[PDB]
Design a protein around this ligand. Structure first.
Ligand SMILES: Nc1ncnc2c1ncn2[C@H]1C[C@H](O)[C@@H](COP(=O)(O)OP(=O)(O)O)O1
Ligand SMILES: Nc1ncnc2c1ncn2[C@H]1C[C@H](O)[C@@H](COP(=O)(O)OP(=O)(O)O)O1
Ligand SMILES: Nc1ncnc2c1ncn2[C@H]1C[C@H](O)[C@@H](COP(=O)(O)OP(=O)(O)O)O1
Ligand SMILES: [Mg+2]
Ligand SMILES: [Mg+2]
Ligand SMILES: [Mg+2]
Lengths: 151, 151, 151
């Protein structure tokens, strides 16, 4: 059975600071299922589309070039309420506003270096997933512990 | 030398997902003293009594069967304000409402699979402990680091 | 280049309970920079000054001798908003009011045994750092991952 999916990316500061495993570990631990993962240095043009709603923000151009300046881990995670719950796990947009226990709360300080991205809605998630993954790159499989995560 | 006591159980999903040590470790780190522990697959009826106050809820009979379907770690933990603090450490009834940093927040998703139980009051704690433990099974001992936990 | 600094101390219960590495590790993970560290058993007189604004509290005299009864780790940490953020990472003054994920939240129970100290303002931090460290003992240096922590 297919459940809600979200797009999660480890940003270049996340890769650079050796936080990839730690982030993935947190999601496995939570009980969510990895459905897609790739490792790329995406194009400025891809990122511009990824962040289209902020295109008019002053930090937008720096943001888009920066997010394309190095490799990122692109992920798709699956599970009930994974979009909003992933956000909670991340913390807030600004690390300064993120609680200890969250990923941004434990590991970073500034809004422009906040190591992780997550879709903010099912609508954004469906678009971001389609943007970063070809349908074939999404793997359908059954986690055997599923019966201990879901009634 | 005797302090407040609460009943904590690692539920069958907690056991299945290999979270026993992780749960106990959090209680040791916090500074609480272990007073009783056993490992059983309890009878459906023991669970019916454990959750007697929920007998009229629609999820109750299923709850009781699930909670008796596999082994659980039954514990009694001791220390100042341990009943309510354990609740804080667990999170909310619903993992969806539990914060990162809490046990349900970090490890589970669904209300019916929330890996851990904790007494909600001293009075419930007194009843749950007597139900799961024989008086002889509660161990009286002194943790020597106590003087660094308690003024 | 030069950022805000705060004074953090591992208190005698922290040292005694073997939590020094855990605490330091939490600050390294967050991205803050160590500028100073020493390990001393300070004088009652130094502590009376350290806590001078609390001079009228009934717990003040007990506090100053306890904080001088054993070795503490004295530290200076540097980074954007490190005064307030360090406080957040600690939790609240009372471990009872501190959330899971914070240092007091994960590790302590009583207000008098809350293992860590942190300056409550840039002003107090400037005084406490100056109280505990000689200008020569403060290290000014550049962490090479700094460019992934700060725009
Ligand atoms: N005020 C700001 N100044 C500089 N960079 C910012 C910024 N706000 C956001 N950025 C960066 C960091 C964010 O991860 C990225 C996307 O912003 P967002 O979508 O509004 O928040 P979020 O990443 O939590 O979804 O833009
Ligand atoms: N709406 C619900 N649907 C399915 N199972 C539920 C449920 N609400 C509670 N359960 C289960 C999970 C709870 O841990 C267990 C005990 O109920 P409770 O006493 O109200 O909560 P708690 O475990 O927080 O003390 O009952
Ligand atoms: N009511 C109280 N009873 C006993 N000890 C207390 C106390 N309040 C504070 N202490 C101790 C623990 C505190 O960390 C220390 C300093 O007090 P504080 O400056 O008011 O708060 P904080 O340590 O959070 O900056 O004094
Ligand atoms: Mg967004
Ligand atoms: Mg209950
Ligand atoms: Mg103070």
């Amino acid at each position: 059975m297919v459940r809600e999916r979200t797009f999660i990316a480890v940003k270049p500061d996340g890769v650079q600071r050796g936080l990839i495993g730690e982030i993935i570990k947190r999601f496995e631990a939570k009980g969510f299922k990895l459905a897609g993962m790739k490792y790329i240095q995406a194009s400025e043009d891809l990122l511009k589309q990824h962040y289209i709603d902020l295109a008019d923000k002053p930090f937008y151009p720096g943001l888009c070039k920066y997010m394309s300046s190095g490799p990122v881990v692109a992920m798709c995670w699956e599970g009930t309420g994974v979009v909003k719950t992933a956000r909670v796990m991340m913390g807030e947009t600004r690390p300064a506003d993120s609680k200890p226990g969250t990923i941004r709360g434990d590991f970073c300080i500034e809004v422009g270096r906040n190591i992780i991205h997550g879709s903010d809605s099912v609508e954004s998630a469906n678009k971001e997933i389609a943007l970063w993954f070809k349908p074939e790159e999404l793997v359908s499989w059954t986690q055997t512990n599923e019966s201990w995560i879901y009634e």
